Amino acid sequence: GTKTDYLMRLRKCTTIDTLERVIEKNKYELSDDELELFYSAADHRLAELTMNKLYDKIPPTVWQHVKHHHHHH
User: Which positions ≥6 away from 58 have C-beta within 8 Å?
Assistant: First the structure.
């Protein structure tokens, strides 16, 4: 059960308000010890959604702002 499954499955959710609906599902069919995976993983997918592109590995700095960013080729 590598993080690939976590990040991919989540990252294709496509909707924030939905991300909630699933998370409650994961709640018992997964496990607390595990949930770090879902928490530590799912965040990555939030900043992208906050705008509308694709992030992929972010410093703890962002989750306090969730606004800053920069364009690039």
Answer: 43, 44, 47
